[PDB]
Enzyme design. Structure first.
Site, PDB file in Angstrom:
ATOM      1  N   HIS A 141      -3.608   0.200  -6.117  1.00 48.72           N
ATOM      2  CA  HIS A 141      -4.980  -0.224  -5.937  1.00 48.72           C
ATOM      3  C   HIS A 141      -6.014   0.867  -6.262  1.00 48.72           C
ATOM      4  O   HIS A 141      -7.203   0.768  -5.831  1.00 48.72           O
ATOM      5  CB  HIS A 141      -5.275  -0.753  -4.491  1.00 48.72           C
ATOM      6  CG  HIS A 141      -4.378  -1.932  -4.168  1.00 48.72           C
ATOM      7  ND1 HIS A 141      -3.731  -2.163  -3.018  1.00 48.72           N
ATOM      8  CD2 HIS A 141      -4.076  -3.008  -4.976  1.00 48.72           C
ATOM      9  CE1 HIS A 141      -3.050  -3.289  -3.082  1.00 48.72           C
ATOM     10  NE2 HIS A 141      -3.264  -3.801  -4.243  1.00 48.72           N
ATOM     11  N   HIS A 177       0.848  -1.195   0.000  1.00 47.31           N
ATOM     12  CA  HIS A 177       0.000   0.000   0.000  1.00 47.31           C
ATOM     13  C   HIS A 177       0.887   1.251   0.000  1.00 47.31           C
ATOM     14  O   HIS A 177       2.033   1.167   0.472  1.00 47.31           O
ATOM     15  CB  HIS A 177      -0.949   0.024   1.171  1.00 47.31           C
ATOM     16  CG  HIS A 177      -1.950  -1.062   1.296  1.00 47.31           C
ATOM     17  ND1 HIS A 177      -2.943  -1.373   0.413  1.00 47.31           N
ATOM     18  CD2 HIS A 177      -2.146  -1.908   2.366  1.00 47.31           C
ATOM     19  CE1 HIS A 177      -3.692  -2.362   0.847  1.00 47.31           C
ATOM     20  NE2 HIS A 177      -3.211  -2.692   2.048  1.00 47.31           N
ATOM     21  N   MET A 237      -9.325   1.913  -3.926  1.00 49.84           N
ATOM     22  CA  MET A 237      -8.625   2.292  -2.667  1.00 49.84           C
ATOM     23  C   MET A 237      -8.253   3.775  -2.733  1.00 49.84           C
ATOM     24  O   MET A 237      -7.111   4.141  -3.062  1.00 49.84           O
ATOM     25  CB  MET A 237      -7.399   1.394  -2.426  1.00 49.84           C
ATOM     26  CG  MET A 237      -6.943   1.683  -0.955  1.00 49.84           C
ATOM     27  SD  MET A 237      -5.937   0.262  -0.427  1.00 49.84           S
ATOM     28  CE  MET A 237      -5.390   0.939   1.219  1.00 49.84           C
ATOM     29  N   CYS A 272      -4.209   5.084  -3.165  1.00 49.06           N
ATOM     30  CA  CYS A 272      -3.106   4.119  -3.161  1.00 49.06           C
ATOM     31  C   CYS A 272      -2.794   3.818  -4.611  1.00 49.06           C
ATOM     32  O   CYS A 272      -3.778   3.390  -5.270  1.00 49.06           O
ATOM     33  CB  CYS A 272      -3.561   2.860  -2.379  1.00 49.06           C
ATOM     34  SG  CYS A 272      -2.261   1.630  -2.634  1.00 49.06           S
TER      35      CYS A 272
HETATM   36 HG   LIG Z   1      -3.233  -0.303  -1.650  1.00 50.06          HG
END
Ligand SMILES: [Hg+2]
Length: 99
Positions: A87, A37, A92, A84
């Protein structure tokens, strides 16, 4: 405020993903589940005059292990969108208001 990177069920979300803080309050992003992340602030979606580079990880930097943290304090008032990078497409994303 503490923000989880990844929910406890493995979903690819910031927990919480929308929140408000006062100026100078520290956000502690905590690597939780579903990594890697990172946290990247969208330069086109933060208050005018704010340097994204100051408050963001590099798109290339990653938190790979459980419990790694990224901490940032915001002072300019307004809305900050973040995501992120790996993602982003999975949804995200998040937004913090400094009020
Ligand atoms: Hg992520």
């Amino acid at each position: 405020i503490d923000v989880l990177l990844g929910a406890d069920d493995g979903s690819l979300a910031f927990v919480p993903s929308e929140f408000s803080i006062s100026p100078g309050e520290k956000i502690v992003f905590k690597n939780n589940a579903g990594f890697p992340h990172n946290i990247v602030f969208d330069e086109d979606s933060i208050p005018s005059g704010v340097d994204a580079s100051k408050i963001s990880m590099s798109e290339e930097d990653l938190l790979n292990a459980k419990g790694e943290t990224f901490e940032v304090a915001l002072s300019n008032k307004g809305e900050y969108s973040f995501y992120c990078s790996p993602h982003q497409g999975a949804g995200m994303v998040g937004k913090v208001t400094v009020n």
